[PDB]
Every structure is written in structure tokens, then in C-alpha cells.
Amino acid sequence: ALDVLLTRLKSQGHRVLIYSQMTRMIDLLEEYMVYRKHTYMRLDGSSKI
DNA sequence: ATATCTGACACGTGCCTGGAGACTAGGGAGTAATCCCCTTGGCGGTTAAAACGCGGGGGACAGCGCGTACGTGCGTTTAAGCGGTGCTAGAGCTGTCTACGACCAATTGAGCG
Q1: Which bases of chain B come closer than 7 Å to a protein CB?
Q2: Coiled-coil segments, which residues?
Q3: Does residue A34 lie within 7 Å of nucleic acid chain B, judged by its CB?
Q4: Helices A2-12 & A23-35, crossing angle to 10 degrees?
């Protein structure tokens, strides 16, 4: 469902934030977002100030 | 029955440990020149080596006796907790002086006459 929404939103040109609960889920989201070369950034609480 | 508790279970950031990248420039690795060394090896004043004849004393008893062992008495030993509360390291920060850097003199080793 997320991939069809990101292809929807990328075709429309809108800027998007993705929220998740788990850092292990954010790893999965990042490996997807890298694989589809979407451009990506992450700021888990283990990121430095 | 109910309030609310003790996991479940996770991502918050702290700390330091611990890795790999790109730089200088300290120093390691490559080399002759050449000397001076570890090493080979004959020389005879000096002591390892073993008898004979021999001196110093090692050896095996008998038993006396100044000390040594057991293991309980009895009064002196440390144990023991937990009161107060001064010491004690943390640790935060100077406030410099002290040992370690930067520039160049008295004294030394090398050259051979």
C-alpha cells in the first residue's frame, strides 16, 4: 500500500513525511526506499543532536 | 470485586570503546667504505690427573638427662552490632612553575703527522 501511495505522491510532486513506531521497521522502510531510489533521510532517536 | 501492580520489550540519549580514512614527516630500510673482529691456531710455565704411604677423623654404640611433647584449666582474649560523625575522594578549578620545547655556546672525537 505504501509503494502505490509513494508512486501516487511522486507523480503528483508532493513532499512526504513517513512515521513509524519501530527502529527495526524504519530499517525495512529504508531498505525499500533505497531499493526504489526515492531519496531518503532518517532521524531515529539513536541519531546524534 | 477491585485498586493497581510488575512485567514486556519497546526506542529515548548518555557514556566510552573502538575502526578506518587522508595527511605530514619521522624514521625505517637499502647500501658502500672500511675497519676492526670473532675467530683460527702454535707456544711450554703452569696445574688437572691419578697412585703409595699415611694423618685426620668418620663411624656405631650405651645411656644420662635439659628439654620436648600432650590437651585441660580458668580468666583473659577478641567477637559482635550499630549509635554518632570526621574523614575522605570526587571533582570543579584555578594559578601558576616546573619540566619540557627552541636558539646557540665549551668541550669532545677524528685525522695523521
Answers
A1: 10-14
A2: none
A3: no
A4: 50
